Amino acid sequence: ARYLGPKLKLSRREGTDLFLKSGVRAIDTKCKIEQAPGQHGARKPRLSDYGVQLREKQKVRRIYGVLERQFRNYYKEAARLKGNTGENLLALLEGRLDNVVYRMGFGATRAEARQLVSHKAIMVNGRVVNIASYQVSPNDVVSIREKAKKQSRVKAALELAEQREKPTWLEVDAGKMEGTFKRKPERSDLSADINEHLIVELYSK
Amino acid sequence: SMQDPIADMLTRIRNGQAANKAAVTMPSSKLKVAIANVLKEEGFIEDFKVEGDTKPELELTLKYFQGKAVVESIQRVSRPGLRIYKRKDELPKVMAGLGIAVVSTSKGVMTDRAARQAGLGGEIICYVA
Amino acid sequence: MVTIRLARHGAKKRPFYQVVVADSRNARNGRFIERVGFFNPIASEKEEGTRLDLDRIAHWVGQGATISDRVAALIKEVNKA
Amino acid sequence: KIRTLQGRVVSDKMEKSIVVAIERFVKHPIYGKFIKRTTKLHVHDENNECGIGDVVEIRECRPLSKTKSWTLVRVVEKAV
Amino acid sequence: ELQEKLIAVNRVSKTVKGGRIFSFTALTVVGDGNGRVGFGYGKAREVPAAIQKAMEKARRNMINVALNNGTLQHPVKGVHTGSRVFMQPASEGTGIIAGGAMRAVLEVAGVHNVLAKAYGSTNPINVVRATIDGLENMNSPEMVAAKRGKSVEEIL
Amino acid sequence: ATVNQLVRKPRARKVAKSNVPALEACPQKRGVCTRVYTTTPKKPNSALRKVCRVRLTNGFEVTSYIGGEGHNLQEHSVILIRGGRVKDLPGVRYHTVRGALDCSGVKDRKQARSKYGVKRPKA
RNA sequence: UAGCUAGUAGGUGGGGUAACGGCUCACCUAGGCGACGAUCCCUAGCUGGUCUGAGAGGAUGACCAGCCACACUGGAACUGA
RNA sequence: CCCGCAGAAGAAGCACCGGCUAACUCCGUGCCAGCAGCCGCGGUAAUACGGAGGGUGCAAGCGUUAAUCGGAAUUACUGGGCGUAAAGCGCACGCAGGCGGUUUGUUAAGUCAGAUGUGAAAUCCCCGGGCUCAACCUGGGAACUGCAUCUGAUACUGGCAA
Ligand SMILES: [Mg+2]
Ligand SMILES: [Mg+2]
Ligand SMILES: [Mg+2]
Ligand SMILES: [Mg+2]
Ligand SMILES: [Mg+2]
Ligand SMILES: [Mg+2]
Ligand SMILES: [Mg+2]
Ligand SMILES: [Mg+2]
Ligand SMILES: [Mg+2]
Ligand SMILES: [Mg+2]
Ligand SMILES: [Mg+2]
Ligand SMILES: [Mg+2]
Ligand SMILES: [Mg+2]
Ligand SMILES: [Mg+2]
Ligand SMILES: [Mg+2]
Ligand SMILES: [Mg+2]
Ligand SMILES: [Mg+2]
Ligand SMILES: [Mg+2]
Ligand SMILES: [Mg+2]
Ligand SMILES: [Mg+2]
Ligand SMILES: [Mg+2]
Ligand SMILES: [Mg+2]
Ligand SMILES: [Mg+2]
Ligand SMILES: [Mg+2]
Ligand SMILES: [Mg+2]
Ligand SMILES: [Mg+2]
Ligand SMILES: [Mg+2]
Ligand SMILES: [Mg+2]
């Protein structure tokens, strides 16, 4: 399924920005990010190791839109694959089609990218994909379809992506509404605010 | 009664190390000499000698580094009550490589690191680390 | 009669046959002796739909193993190459 | 180069037949200890060229009777 | 640069003519992400005073251990009065697999990838000392070569 | 401890005893009520607990607590026990299912509603 | 559950089965199994496998496959490779 | 399977919130009604009962119950104990059995190495491929720790002789 409730509420619960909005305005200008939601907010929660591990896992889950049943399978795949379990999980999450679209800039939000993929406005290697969890392989090409290439939202997404930081492992041509997945993203190419070691220890409890 | 002279030798060495004894004396044996050869080659002891012709006494010179002992752990994996036989594909590795598993192979007595290269297994006499 | 036939496996609406030598008494997807090649009727291009073992099939046809119509058609198709 | 087994003899009271107490060295699957699980058989003894406490070598042949399936080929160490 | 941590806080009860007297005990661990690591146990009528005494006694009486890159050199056991501990190295990525005070002392000791298990009583006071003893009595290739008279390449 | 002793007399796993024997490994069991009454718990608790005596199809005559605030259970009724003991009730170890064949769900309850067999209120 | 077995263990000679064989018969030996558990009681189809467990291990054998038994119950025989 | 029609329209619920375990305030009650897996709560300010608000965990599933394993190193071969928590027969002799000082020679059974046959297929795993991804199917390989035979090695145990 998908989460249809408020997103700034989840951002406040996690204590940091999760990029679930377009980014035209700031977070403080839209909500009280420093105050937890509910009547018992305005006080910093005092959590244990299990609580902080749960928060670390929920932050990634809410950022990427994945649920527990589909995230445990990703963790199992990462553990099965050789190498760092924590880095492989992040690489697999970044390999999702909606995440790739969001990074390229064809969608302002990951939810918008998922909606586009569902509504079949995106094709990979000339073949349309109707799954928001498609695993992208290196040297793949993701291009917008002609039927939806004239979208104000689809161009404002690129206009916000150019303001945002660019991904090194990807390439994009805004004129052609096309992008290329060059290589599998590494740990250094991602954000440093996610401690992936708190997820392996949580799932191996 | 005495039913494990090899274990008796190992316990004598361990007690000498614990009591800071320079030399250890015991009855000699063809297997004890071979085990002392492996120990001397691996450096766990300084030297070994045998004195006599009909009642040979084996003497070992223990090694002490920086005041303490060298042999911190010494066991008897195989015992008369339970014989241990392992192939080359499943030879043990004491202390991940920092220890020695003395192995009696078809060619003689040698460590696990030397037996795996030769590609033969045998009996696992003792663990030293 | 010991015969060479196609045992069906795979998911529904996407069958996958395996050419096996078995007694005619036994069931289709049950007991067999040797497995010789497969067949995917819905296979796309650049994907092998036939990997029969002609040498082994002849080894049984010389001992008395008969050949079904589909097996003969597959043998003819693989020989036409 | 014929598969044969060697073992002691326990009884010779039966007519033209004996029994063999085959002994072996089997390792325990769980505790990894070697034990001695013996096995008894009935062996044909044409001419009665055997005795109690003797070591014999046997061979697997056709079943001579309900409990007979082995025959001897020779006798060694005829200790009294 | 140190990372102090608090493991367990308990409440003891004395007995006098008037009645019961309650005191508080604090167990703390100190580390720097490297071989430096120490433990402290304090007793005081107030929790802040107890933790301050524990930190003061932990900053002193520290110990030195050896790591290969961020893990243990070899599997090792530690034994105390009523606590048994086993801990072995692992590959980079699996993290720390331990429970209670063990995962709190290894984290400040800087060991990032280990597999550990506790057998017997899991009292924090004993398990912390057992882990310290187990980390102390483990050897490095250079240390074992220095006493065996060989080289690291010859030992492997 | 000795290997010879272990070989001679093997190591035996202690048998686990089931605390719910009347169900015969079945999660739910239908039964007929025989006697419904209030019961006095043990120390330190003090209340009146609704307890029914039931006779299952297998022939076991057992006891079952009745949860919820209020019930319509009476003699000659049919209930469905599920399992679960009450510790402050020394002598009963089974719970009943609300919303069963004849058991009625509790009234005016809107929290933990699935456990008491009450329909979703219209809204 | 500490004693069981008299066609019972074996041998000789007939008979019998597609085939060896107390499978059966006539006679002669007093033997045979059993503390490494004979006999007796209760439960249970077996395996490849499945679940859990890092691992040795514990539980189990539904659906897929192989083997065995049965077709209301207890026995019987014919045709038939 | 693909292309047009119109319109957010026809589509979210369950459990929990004292600690174990992530998530708190108010109102009715008063050892009464009641919750419960354990500690336990309730005897007028109950974060533990019932309701409301809010929050947390999952999601077309969510909870409860029954069974197995794990944690249980709580049957401990790997992996435990018997002075005081439970655990040394009241003490001796001794059959079977278990183990056994030292040297040489030989046999080569256990053990060690290699090879052959087999260990069905299906299932686990690895590298890939195809159903719009996945589940699913499928190609090859590894594995099935085993067993039987042969060729040998002789350090240890055992068989034999001195
Ligand atoms: Mg689903
Ligand atoms: Mg304990
Ligand atoms: Mg007769
Ligand atoms: Mg005749
Ligand atoms: Mg006859
Ligand atoms: Mg049955
Ligand atoms: Mg375990
Ligand atoms: Mg079974
Ligand atoms: Mg019927
Ligand atoms: Mg009938
Ligand atoms: Mg006929
Ligand atoms: Mg909490
Ligand atoms: Mg409740
Ligand atoms: Mg109140
Ligand atoms: Mg409530
Ligand atoms: Mg509410
Ligand atoms: Mg266990
Ligand atoms: Mg104990
Ligand atoms: Mg007492
Ligand atoms: Mg006592
Ligand atoms: Mg005494
Ligand atoms: Mg000897
Ligand atoms: Mg041999
Ligand atoms: Mg071999
Ligand atoms: Mg694919
Ligand atoms: Mg197989
Ligand atoms: Mg010898
Ligand atoms: Mg002996």
- Could you write out the DSSP letters of every residue in E42-81? EEESSHHHHHHHHHHHHHSS-B---BSSSSBSS-EEEE-S
Considering its fold, how many domains does chain F have in total? Answer: 1
Cα distance between residue E141 and residue B127, in whole Å:
18
| Angle, helix A85-94 to helix A68-80, in steps of 10 degrees | 130
Beta bridge partners of D22: D39
- Please give the angle made by the CA atoms of F88, F90 and F95, to the nearest 5 degrees: 75
Beta bridge partners of B27: B57
E135 CB-contact burial (10 Å; exposed 0-12 / middle 13-18 / buried 19+):
buried
Between chains, do A197 and E112 touch, taking CB under 8 Å as contact? yes
> Do both A32 and A83 map to the same domain?
yes
> Do both A126 and A152 map to the same domain?
yes
Measure CA of the first residue to CA of the last residue in chain F; give whole Å: 69
Here the tokens at position A78 are 């990462």
Q: Which nucleotides of H are covered by protein (CB under 7 A)?
A: 2-4, 8, 12-16, 20-25, 31-43, 50-60, 62-69, 72-73, 75-77, 80-82, 97-104, 109-114, 120-121, 125-127, 129-140, 148-150, 152-157
> Could you say which DSSP state residue A198 is in?
H
Task: State the residue range of the domain holding A130.
Answer: 94-181
Residue B99 Cβ under 7 A from any strand H atom? no
F87: CB partners within 8 A, 6+ apart: none
Considering its fold, how many domains does chain A have in total? Answer: 2
Peptide bond preceding F44 in cis form (omega within 30 of 0): yes
Cα distance between residue B121 and residue B104, in whole Å:
8
Cα distance between residue B77 and residue B56, in whole Å:
26
Backbone angles phi, psi at B54, to 5 degrees: -120, -30
Task: State the residue range of the domain holding F72.
Answer: 1-123
> Do both A199 and A168 map to the same domain?
no
E151 CB-contact burial (10 Å; exposed 0-12 / middle 13-18 / buried 19+):
exposed
Chain F residues whose C-beta sits inside 8 Å of any chain B C-beta: 2-4
Cβ pair B32, B13 in contact under 8 A: no
CATH label of the domain that carries residue F123 = 2.40.50.140
Cβ pair E55, E93 in contact under 8 A: no
CB A4: neighbour CB atoms within 10 A? 7
Beta bridge partners of E22: E13
Handedness of CA A91, A96, A98, A104 (dihedral sign): positive
Q: Which of residues 10-69 of F touch strand H (CB under 7 A)?
A: 11-14, 16, 18, 20, 23, 25-28, 38, 41, 44-50, 67-69
Cα distance between residue E148 and residue B46, in whole Å:
10
Q: Where are the beta strands (DSSP E) in chain E?
A: 5-15, 20-31, 37-44, 76-79, 83-89, 96-97, 114-120
| Residue A131 in domain | yes
Reading phi first (left if > 0) and then psi (alpha if -120 to 50, else beta), residue E33 is in left
CATH label of the domain that carries residue A99 = 3.10.290.10
Domain ranges of chain B: 1-71, 72-129
Q: Is A196 helix (H, G, I), strand (E, B) or coil?
A: coil
Strands D70-76 and D26-27: unpaired
D62: CB partners within 8 A, 6+ apart: D69
Cβ pair D50, D74 in contact under 8 A: no
Residue with tokens 């916000």: A160
Cα distance between residue A131 and residue A117, in whole Å:
6
Cα distance between residue F123 and residue F108, in whole Å:
15
Here the tokens at position F16 are 């686990």
**E46 close to A (CB below 8 A):** no
Q: D33, D13, D17: which is closest to D25 by C-alpha?
A: D33
Cα distance between residue A100 and residue A180, in whole Å:
10
> Do both A86 and A99 map to the same domain?
no
> Do both A32 and A71 map to the same domain?
yes
B118: CB partners within 8 A, 6+ apart: B105, B107, B110
- What's chain D's Rg over C-alpha atoms? 14
Q: Which nucleotides of G are covered by protein (CB under 7 A)?
A: 8-12, 20-23, 28-34, 36, 54, 57-59, 64-67
Q: How was this structure determined?
A: cryo-EM
> Do both A120 and A87 map to the same domain?
no
Cβ pair A145, A113 in contact under 8 A: no
Here the tokens at position A70 are 């589909």
Cα distance between residue E72 and residue A120, in whole Å:
52
CB A21: neighbour CB atoms within 10 A? 18
Cα distance between residue B39 and residue A136, in whole Å:
58
Reduced DSSP (H G I as helix, E B as strand, rest coil) percent helix, strand, coil of chain D, to 5: 5, 45, 50
Q: Is C10 helix (H, G, I), strand (E, B) or coil?
A: strand
> Do both A70 and A101 map to the same domain?
no
Helix segments in chain F, DSSP class H: 3-8
Q: Is E145 helix (H, G, I), strand (E, B) or coil?
A: helix
CB B32: neighbour CB atoms within 10 A? 21
Cβ pair B45, B15 in contact under 8 A: no
Here the tokens at position A88 are 């492989």
Cα distance between residue A2 and residue A113, in whole Å:
13
- In CATH, the architecture of B1-71 is 2-Layer Sandwich (3.30)
Q: Which long-range CB contacts under 8 A does E142-150 form with residues at least 24 apart?
A: E143/E66, E144/B98, E146/B65, E147/B43, E147/B63, E147/B65, E147/B66, E147/B70, E148/B42, E148/B43, E148/B44, E148/B70, E149/B43, E150/B42, E150/B43
| Residue A2 in domain | no
Q: How many A from CA of E79 to the centre of ligand 19?
A: 29
C-alpha pair distances (Å), B118 with each of A170, B91, B113, B114, B127: 52, 13, 9, 7, 20
> Do both A86 and A157 map to the same domain?
no
Cα distance between residue A154 and residue A176, in whole Å:
12
H or E segment at A124?
strand A122-124
CB E122: neighbour CB atoms within 10 A? 15
Q: How many A from CA of F27 to the centre of ligand 23?
A: 58
Q: How many A from CA of E124 to the centre of ligand 2?
A: 13
| Angle, helix A152-163 to helix A110-118, in steps of 10 degrees | 150
Q: Which of residues 56-115 of A touch strand H (CB under 7 A)?
A: 57-58, 61, 67-70, 80-82, 115
D53: CB partners within 8 A, 6+ apart: D8, D9, D79, D80
Between chains, do F4 and B82 touch, taking CB under 8 Å as contact? no
E12: CB partners within 8 A, 6+ apart: E22, E23, E24, E25, E43
Protein CA A78 to sugar C1' H136 (Å): 21
Cα distance between residue E82 and residue C19, in whole Å:
66
CB A123: neighbour CB atoms within 10 A? 15
C-alpha pair distances (Å), F16 with each of E32, F13, F19, F87: 49, 9, 10, 20
Cβ pair C68, C3 in contact under 8 A: yes
Cα distance between residue B64 and residue B56, in whole Å:
26
Cα distance between residue E82 and residue E130, in whole Å:
9
Cα distance between residue A201 and residue A193, in whole Å:
17
Query: Closest nucleotide to residue C27 (Cα to C1')?
Result: G65
Q: E22, E26, E24, E23: which is closest to E51 by C-alpha?
A: E26
Neighbours of E, requiring at least 3 CB pairs below 8 Å, are A, B
A125 CB-contact burial (10 Å; exposed 0-12 / middle 13-18 / buried 19+):
exposed
CA A100 to chain CA centroid, nearest Å: 8
> Which residues 45-74 of A have a C-beta within 8 angstroms of E?
49
Residue D71's identity, in one-letter code, is T
How many residue pairs from chains B and D have C-beta atoms closer than 8 A?
Answer: 7
Cα distance between residue A63 and residue A103, in whole Å:
13
Cβ pair E8, E124 in contact under 8 A: yes
Here the tokens at position A115 are 């909606």
Here the tokens at position F101 are 């064949």
**E18 close to B (CB below 8 A):** no
Please compute, for residue F82, the number of CA atoms within 13 A of its CA located in the half-sphere on the CB side.
Answer: 13
Residue A65's identity, in one-letter code, is G
Here the tokens at position E131 are 């882990």
Neighbours of C, requiring at least 3 CB pairs below 8 Å, are none
Cα distance between residue A95 and residue A178, in whole Å:
17
Q: Where are the beta strands (DSSP E) in chain F?
A: 29-39, 49-56, 61-65, 78-81, 94-95
> Do both A38 and A114 map to the same domain?
no
> Do both A88 and A101 map to the same domain?
no
H or E segment at B101?
strand B100-105
Nearest CA distance, B2 vs chain E (angstrom): 31
> Do both A167 and A105 map to the same domain?
yes
Residues of F in contact with D37 (CB under 8 A): none
E70: CB partners within 8 A, 6+ apart: E92, E110, E111, E112, E113
C55: CB partners within 8 A, 6+ apart: none
Cβ pair A14, A58 in contact under 8 A: yes
Cβ pair B96, E74 in contact under 8 A: yes
C-alpha pair distances (Å), B79 with each of B3, C5, F61: 9, 60, 59
Cα distance between residue E128 and residue E135, in whole Å:
11
Please identify, in words, the CATH class of the domain defined by B72-129.
alpha beta
Residues of D in contact with F8 (CB under 8 A): none
> Do both A140 and A80 map to the same domain?
no
CB E89: neighbour CB atoms within 10 A? 19
H or E segment at C7?
strand C2-11
Cβ pair E110, E34 in contact under 8 A: yes
